[PDB]
Amino acid sequence: TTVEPILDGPYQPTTFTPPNDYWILINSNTNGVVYESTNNSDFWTAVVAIEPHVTPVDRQYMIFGESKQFNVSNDSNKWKFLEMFRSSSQNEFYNRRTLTSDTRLVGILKYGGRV
Amino acid sequence: TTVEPILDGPYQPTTFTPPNDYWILINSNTNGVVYESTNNSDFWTAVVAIEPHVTPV
């Protein structure tokens, strides 16, 4: 009799298109960007994780290849996960909030045509 | 009785320090840089793989 593994495996930081009905959970190893999603048509999104007690600063990130800028800040003692959102190529970077924690984890899923 | 796999597996594009006495073989997926070695002290080497029949650029 073979037993299922308790977890499905710490896979590696790759790009792909995960099918639906599946939670993707991610733990951060470095600072800055953790993951980004997009359909490249009418939906672009990324996140950045920042250490607790960081001052309000504009920072630079190798996002979408072409490095971009945006503001970040965190005062609470938990890590802060700031999302950035865009509905078009010709648009501003709607900086959307958020996920705060000390687990150092993030989670996404596809269902009902909704992320 | 278990047998060895025919080859040690297509591992993933990581950074680390392979110990000695081990060939590291690499196949390229994209264009341009495939890998780089260094010691950050007195040695910095990289490679770039280029498709055949390319102009000097």
């Epitope: 710490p10 590696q12 | 990581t14 950074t15 680390f16 950050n40 002290s41």
Partner: antibody
Framework: EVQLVESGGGPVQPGGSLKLSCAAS????????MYWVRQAPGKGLEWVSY????????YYADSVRGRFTISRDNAKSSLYLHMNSLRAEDTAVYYC??????????????????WGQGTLVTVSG | NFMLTQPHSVSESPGKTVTISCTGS????????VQWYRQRPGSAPTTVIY?????PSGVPARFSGSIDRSSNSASLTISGLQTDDEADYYC??????????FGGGTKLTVLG
């Protein structure tokens, strides 16, 4: 668990001689480096020696040239320092250790807190 | 090399947040990793932070750290200062060549 053991402490005549030993148990100690650092009041710990996979290459710190000497035994899995005839500043606790930085993935902690307790060695007479 | 200057002492009232820095005179702390070292006079010291912010298991969440790139420094933030925060806190990292670069003994004595 991982264990560092050491020995060789006691009073030391300046201009004298003795031996210091630091063996390790819980890890490989062939793919690691090993150093030594003397700790004392607020001068602070500092680098002493350097051995890393025996290239027939090593390094020494400022106040240890010649009168220290180092040896790294993979078999016994230890560092062996032969000590002679130095200034009284050597009154200190000697520490052996190595921090390892290689990208272990998630799912298991290969991480040490790599510090033996050290050995006290005072220069007196 | 770049020596790692420290505030040779610092304190606040225990029970709130405090910060201790460690600044490299030249070079760049962003070049490689930095690790932090708590120490007691009694027996022997222990590590508190490695890889510049990788908190180690067993040690509580009261500690954390980050890097100021522009000012060439690392820093640590401590929340909920216990009675046994009395310690010394060294910082150290690597040099242009891998031997190490160290910081002065930062004597942390917090009281009111």
């Amino acid at each position: 668990e991982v264990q560092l053991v050491e020995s060789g402490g006691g009073p030391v005549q300046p201009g004298g001689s003795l031996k210091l030993s630091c063996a390790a148990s819980g890890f490989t100690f062939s793919n690691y480096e090993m150093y030594w650092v003397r700790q004392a009041p607020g001068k602070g710990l500092e680098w002493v020696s350097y051995i890393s996979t025996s290239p027939a290459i090593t390094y020494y710190a400022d106040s240890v040239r010649g009168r220290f000497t180092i040896s790294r035994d993979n078999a016994k899995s230890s560092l062996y320092l032969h000590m002679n005839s130095l200034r009284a500043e050597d009154t200190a606790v000697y520490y052996c250790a190595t921090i390892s930085h290689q990208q272990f993935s998630s799912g298991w902690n290969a991480w040490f807190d790599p510090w033996g307790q050290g050995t006290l060695v005072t220069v007196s007479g | 090399n770049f020596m790692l200057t420290q505030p040779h002492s610092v304190s606040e009232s225990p029970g709130k947040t405090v910060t201790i820095s460690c600044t490299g005179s030249s070079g760049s702390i962003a070049s490689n990793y930095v690790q932090w070292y708590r120490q007691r006079p009694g027996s022997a010291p222990t590590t508190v932070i490695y890889e510049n912010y990788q908190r180690p298991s067993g040690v509580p969440a009261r500690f954390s750290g980050s890097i100021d790139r522009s000012s060439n420094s690392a820093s640590l933030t401590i929340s909920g200062l216990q009675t046994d925060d009395e310690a010394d806190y060294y910082c150290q990292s690597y040099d242009n060549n891998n031997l190490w670069v160290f910081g002065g003994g930062t004597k942390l004595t917090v009281l009111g």
